[PDB]
Amino acid sequence: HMASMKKKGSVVIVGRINLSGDTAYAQQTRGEEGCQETSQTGRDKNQVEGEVQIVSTATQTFLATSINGVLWTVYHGAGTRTIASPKGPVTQMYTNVDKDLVGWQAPQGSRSLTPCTCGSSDLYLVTRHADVIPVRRRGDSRGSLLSPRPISYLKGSSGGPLLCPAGHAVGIFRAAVSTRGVAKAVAFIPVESLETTMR
Numbered sequence: 001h002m003a004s005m006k007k008k009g010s011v012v013i014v015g016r017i018n019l020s021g022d023t024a025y026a027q028q029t030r031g032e033e034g035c036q037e038t039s040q041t042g043r044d045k046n047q048v049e050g051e052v053q054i055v056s057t058a059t060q061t062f063l064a065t066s067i068n069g070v071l072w073t074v075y076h077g078a079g080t081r082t083i084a085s086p087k088g089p090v091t092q093m094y095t096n097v098d099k100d101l102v103g104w105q106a107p108q109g110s111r112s113l114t115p116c117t118c119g120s121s122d123l124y125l126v127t128r129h130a131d132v133i134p135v136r137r138r139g140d141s142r143g144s145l146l147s148p149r150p151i152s153y154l155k156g157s158s159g160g161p162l163l164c165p166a167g168h169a170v171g172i173f174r175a176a177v178s179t180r181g182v183a184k185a186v187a188f189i190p191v192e193s194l195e196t197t198m199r
């Protein structure tokens with residue numbers, strides 16, 4: 001009934017994939033009790049750093065990637081949720097269920113990836129475990145893993161980047177193409193589609 005209707009919590013940044021040096025590694029910045037509290041209030045005063053965030057709702061954990069001053073992730077992870085920030089929940093500025101895409105203004109302190117204009121097909125997928133997986137681009141929105149992996153390896157990495165050799169953003173990881181549980185290929189949201197959404 002109306003008086004007891006609940007509100008969904010905010011997406012919460014709970015860590016990051018550190019790409020600042022020679023070694024990629026995952027960092028946790030918020031434990032579970034802080035996350036639950038931050039999801040309810042929408043107030044997250046942690047300092048944000050880096051391009052790839054680890055984010056969580058009460059029921060899911062996935063990634064989010066800053067490109068052109070927007071923190072982007074998948075609709076199938078975030079739905080229409082706000083994201084927590086120092087002064088309270090922040091409403092999405094982009095929502096496109098047909099592209100499986102959402103975005104919020106990039107957090108203060110984050111850094112953004114540059115959209116790739118290289119036109120290269122040798123790509124690199126960054127996972128929530130800070131694995132950097134070589135991927136050969138196979139079409140506008142697909143790439144094959146040079147070494148296939150069980151889907152278990154990729155679960156929770158939606159919203160992460162596919163990068164070119166120079167570290168530019170080529171797309172956002174959306175779905176795994178799996179045969180008998182082995183991911184031979186991935187589908188991604190091309191960065192051109194993000195740039196069209198921004199218009």
Ligand SMILES: COc1ccc2nc(C)c(O[C@@H]3C[C@H]4C(=O)N[C@]5(C(=O)NS(=O)(=O)C6(C)CC6)C[C@H]5/C=C\CCCCC[C@H](NC(=O)OC(C)(C)C(F)(F)F)C(=O)N4C3)nc2c1
Pocket residue numbers: 060061062063075076077097098099100151152154155156157158173174175176177178187
């Ligand atoms: C709710 O409104 C919407 C709107 C648009 C959507 N668009 C799509 C595409 C959609 O697909 C959903 C969601 C997505 C998904 O699991 N992603 C990943 C992830 O890690 N997620 S996640 O972080 O753990 C989390 C679950 C917390 C957030 C990267 C995946 C890692 C491992 C694969 C696990 C096995 C699932 C394989 C499946 N393969 C698949 O569908 O491949 C085809 C058929 C070729 C196509 F055609 F999809 F490309 C698959 O990958 N997925 C099914 N759901 C949507 C829902």
Ligand SMILES: [Zn+2]
Pocket residue numbers: 115116117118119164165166167168169
């Ligand atoms: Zn590039």
